[PDB]
Amino acid sequence: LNLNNEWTLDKLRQRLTKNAQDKLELHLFMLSGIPDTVFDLVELEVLKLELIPDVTIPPSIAQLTGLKELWLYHTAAKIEAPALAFLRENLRALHIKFTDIKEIPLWIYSLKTLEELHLTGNLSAENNRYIVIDG
Amino acid sequence: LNLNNEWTLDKLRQRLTKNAQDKLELHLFMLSGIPDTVFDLVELEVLKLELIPDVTIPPSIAQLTGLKELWLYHTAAKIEAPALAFLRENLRALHIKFTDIKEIPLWIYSLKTLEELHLTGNLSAENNRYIVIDG
């Protein structure tokens, strides 16, 4: 509530940017969570989340019918089945920048419409090569 | 009254939309009433009200010199003479979506410049066919 109040519902629209790939993006960093005002920005195509702890994706993400990219940079995420199915059906690319496995959402391998996967970080550990990517 | 404290020219401005016919529109739903700050958005041309109870049209509507359309979806509306006269002289279309007669404003038939009327709902009652439209 305090976050959504201090970062007003609409100031966000002035803050949006159409990026180099001609996709409308929003970039967020270092917040305590996701403002609920985000999911009224129906024009979105690329969401970037940077260094946000303990995130759970709410079902209102199904409102963002045009979303094509999600970037999770050091932002662990959990999710339930309706939002999860929406993302299963409505996503082209996924970018992840991680410190270790705990910042890798396990649900990604249950996805079906993905066209790009981008992992940034060391995928290997001592004597355990590529266990992380068996799926 | 405290609704008129938050929505503002600036806030509502970013939320506005220019529609397919190059008409500035605002769509609102499921609020407690009409913010008075709405009527300082002097460029507005279409007003939409959806599922808002117990609405009364205030006189500040005379500030919207460019209004051409009003859409009343399940919203009965009271009004007094000044706002009524402004609307008599400055309106082209009226859309109504209703469940029954209680959501039909009685004053619409005293209008004179209307060019379109759109009614969604049963226009008849038991043993009273088309009494709703005699006027």
Q: Is the dihedral of CA B61, B66, B68, B69 positive or negative?
A: negative
Would the CB atoms of B11 and A13 count as touching at under 8 Å?
no
Residue A41: closest C-alpha in chain B: B15
Collapsing DSSP to helix, strand or coil, B131 comes out as: helix
Is residue B76 within 8 Å of B52, Cβ to Cβ?
no
Is residue B68 within 8 Å of B91, Cβ to Cβ?
yes
Is residue A110 within 8 Å of A135, Cβ to Cβ?
no
Q: Mutating which of B8, B12, B13, B14 best tests the A interface, going by the most A Cβ atoms within 10 A?
A: B14
Is residue B30 within 8 Å of B50, Cβ to Cβ?
yes
Judged on CB neighbours under 10 Å (0-12, 13-18, 19+), B116 is: exposed
- Which among A68, A131, A81 has a CA at the least distance from the CA of A110? A81
C-alpha A52/C-alpha A14 separation (Å) is 22
Would the CB atoms of A13 and B14 count as touching at under 8 Å?
yes
Residues in chain B within 8 Å Cβ distance of A8: 11
Resolution (A): 2.8
Residues 6 or more apart whose Cβ sits within 8 Å of residue B116: B92, B93, B94, B95
Is residue A67 within 8 Å of A90, Cβ to Cβ?
yes
How far, in Å, are A82, A85, A88, B37 from residue A79 at the CA level? 9, 10, 12, 38
Would the CB atoms of A14 and B14 count as touching at under 8 Å?
yes
φ and ψ at B69, to 5 degrees?
-135, 145
Considering only CB atoms, which residues of chain A are within 8 Å of chain B? 8-11, 13-14
C-alpha B97/C-alpha B84 separation (Å) is 20
Alpha helices in B18-127 (DSSP H): 81-89
C-alpha A131/C-alpha B15 separation (Å) is 48
Burial A40-60 (b: 16+ CB within 10 A, else e): bbeebbbbbbeebeebebeee
- Which among A79, A91, A99, A87 has a CA at the least distance from the CA of A117? A91
3-state secondary structure chain A: CHHHHHCCCCHHHHHCEECCCCCEEEEEECCCCCCHHHHHCCCCCEEEEECCCCEECCHHHHHCCCCCEEEEECCCEECCHHHHHHHHHCCCEEEEECCCHHHCCHHHHHCCCCCEEEEECCCCCCCCCCCCCCC
Residue A13: closest C-alpha in chain B: B14
**Resolved by:** cryo-EM
C-alpha B77/C-alpha B35 separation (Å) is 15
Residues in chain A within 8 Å Cβ distance of B14: 10-11, 13-14
Q: Which residue has the tokens 């609405």?
A: B55
C-alpha B105/C-alpha B87 separation (Å) is 13
Residue A18, beta-bridge partner list: A24
Residue B16: closest C-alpha in chain A: A10
Q: Provide the edge-to-edge strand list for the sheet that holds B93-97.
A: B17-18, B24-29, B46-50, B69-73, B93-97, B116-120
Is residue A42 within 8 Å of A19, Cβ to Cβ?
no
8-state DSSP, B102: G
Q: How many CA atoms lie within 13 A of A18 on its CB side?
A: 2
